[PDB]
Design a protein around this nucleic acid. Sequence first.
RNA 1: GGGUGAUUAGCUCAGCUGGGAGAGCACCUCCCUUACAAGGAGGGGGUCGGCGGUUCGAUCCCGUCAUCACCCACCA
RNA 2: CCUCCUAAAGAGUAACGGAGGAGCACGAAGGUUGGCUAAUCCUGGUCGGACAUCAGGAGGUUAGUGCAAUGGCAUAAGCCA
RNA 3: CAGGGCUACACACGUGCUACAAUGGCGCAUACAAAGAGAAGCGACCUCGCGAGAGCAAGCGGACCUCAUAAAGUGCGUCGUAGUCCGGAUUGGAGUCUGCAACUCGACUCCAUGAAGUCGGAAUCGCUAGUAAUCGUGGAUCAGAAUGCCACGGUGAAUACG
Lengths: 177, 39, 114, 79
Amino acid sequence: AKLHDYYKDEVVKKLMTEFNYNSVMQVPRVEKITLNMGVGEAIADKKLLDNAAADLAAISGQKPLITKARKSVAGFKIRQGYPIGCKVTLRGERMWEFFERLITIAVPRIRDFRGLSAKSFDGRGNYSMGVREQIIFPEIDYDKVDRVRGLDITITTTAKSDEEGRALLAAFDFPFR
Amino acid sequence: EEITASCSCGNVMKIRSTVGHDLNLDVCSKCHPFFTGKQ
Amino acid sequence: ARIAGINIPDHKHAVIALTSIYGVGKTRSKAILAAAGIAEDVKISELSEGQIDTLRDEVAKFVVEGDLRREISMSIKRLMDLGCYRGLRHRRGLPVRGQRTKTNARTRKGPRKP
Amino acid sequence: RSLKKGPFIDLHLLKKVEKAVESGDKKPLRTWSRRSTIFPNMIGLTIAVHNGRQHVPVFVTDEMVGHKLGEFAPTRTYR
RNA sequence: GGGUGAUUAGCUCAGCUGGGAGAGCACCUCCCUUACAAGGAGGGGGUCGGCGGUUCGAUCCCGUCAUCACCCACCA
RNA sequence: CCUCCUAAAGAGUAACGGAGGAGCACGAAGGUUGGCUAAUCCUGGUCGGACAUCAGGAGGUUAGUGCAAUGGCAUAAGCCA
RNA sequence: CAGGGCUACACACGUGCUACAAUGGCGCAUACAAAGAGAAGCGACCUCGCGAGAGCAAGCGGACCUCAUAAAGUGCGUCGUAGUCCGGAUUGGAGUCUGCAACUCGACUCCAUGAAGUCGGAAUCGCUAGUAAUCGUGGAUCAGAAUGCCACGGUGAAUACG
Ligand SMILES: [Mg+2]
Ligand SMILES: [Mg+2]
Ligand SMILES: [Mg+2]
Ligand SMILES: [Mg+2]
Ligand SMILES: [Mg+2]
Ligand SMILES: [Zn+2]
């Protein structure tokens, strides 16, 4: 609720004074945040994905959803419709909670940090990034590790340009080299 | 469930997180060496 | 104990538990525990916020773990853009500090490449 | 790591420093010596390091602080 | 012309009813020997003649092209 | 036995004419209700790669339809419970 | 005469060095030798630097002075089996002293890094008593180096039916 209200006053007035839009609904707001983990080496170990799903349901609050293999490829020796990866979609109150517990207490426990990159936008105002370690979330006891399983984050917003999304996230910390 | 994180910067900050436990930190967004790191 | 990086060392004497983190070793560990007034035969059990942040501030008075890595990287980039003899040996994988390239340089040259 | 208290430099190279600085970029600078340590006054100079038969036209950049001539010019052709 | 089988490491064969390329001799590096061969230990080597394709995917499945081997080419 | 052309715009129409498939499958792949819309390319994204799983854009049936081909299918005959 | 080069490196072999650990490693307290060398040389003692170094100058042509307080060994406390506090390469920085000179080249201190290596395929070497093995030291070469050569000392085994 906190950074939601922080948006709801300061980021709204800040971006409106920056880009002087015709109306307030034309401002960028964050629409959803999705989280992906490609478990692919679980073609044999069926419960590798089961424990990775427990890891993501410890990172997020909500139970995850598996992904079906779209079309079979021999480049990765997969069958079409295979237990292949796990995702979590976040909207609303849990989305703002996840962004709060991300930017406060997880980015500075990234291994040997320096600021995130600039050209990581889509071009139509979205963002994505991938991690290496996974005890960067506090919900993982250090004596429970079984692989170095990372994951990637997608912040999907209604930014009509990537520069508008850049100025949206410059109202946050959002490290910015 | 809502917990309370607290770092070494004096930033006492209560948040919802599914740790199920109160939290001790160092670096927050406030007082992290980001601009001094870039310099 | 999320000090100085990802290491949470546990059930160690602190004189070795401070060597356990990259970029900090034995003599630095002894000097830190002297400056904090900590005995050598302690364990990481019963550790507090003061015993975190005093150690982190005394080691934040020193170059640690991120900027040291990119300082090594910037020294290597400086020597590569320099094109010195030592930079050429760093870029081509040959023992720099006055060794013999002929026999038994396999730490630098890796395993035997036939 | 080396050269305790005051480095060691060259007579004729030291002279040719002023012979080029006070008299303009006439030529590349010709020395049979590979010894002196680079000071920032030498920025903007084509000098030559002889490798055993042949000179290399060394230009000096800003970050050549404690660095050396033959350290810039190795003397072994490979492969 | 026409029916049958084959093109695989340097050499010779099994791998073709579909998803990881094996066997033997040779090659290379060591070993005992004054020195070879034999003997003992350890390695890599193909992109399955070639063109196209089906399929997620081809040495394998399909249609031609180059080469090889075999059988027929009778009534006259 | 099935499909296209040869079939000359109703049906049909031969040849040692040109090209392909079938001698199966399913207790869901069937019935109904409610609902969804694919291929390919670009961008950003840890291992991750020309191509696995995420998000967006172009595009708009080129994809799918148990299989050979033809016809058809958006009110879907494709996909989920 | 100046300068580069026997110190290059896709690889094999010989000679060796240090470890792979607990009979081990660390920290503290800790007692026991020999033959040596020395004047353009050895360098006590004090002061600064954690230390590697710098200044001062006693003595010694030498059983007097210098190299110098050797180490395993013993008690305590330790790390309790891991690539570990074992191991030390490779590398970044900062040094010192030598010598005109340290890039092709060194020797050492410190800060930080911690690869493979958990006892070694076929084969192969030495050794009958203070030796086999292990731990120190001294010299010669030299202006500067040793894991090399020459020499000395500490502890100190097994087996021989044949
Ligand atoms: Mg008609
Ligand atoms: Mg008709
Ligand atoms: Mg319906
Ligand atoms: Mg005898
Ligand atoms: Mg020897
Ligand atoms: Zn903080």
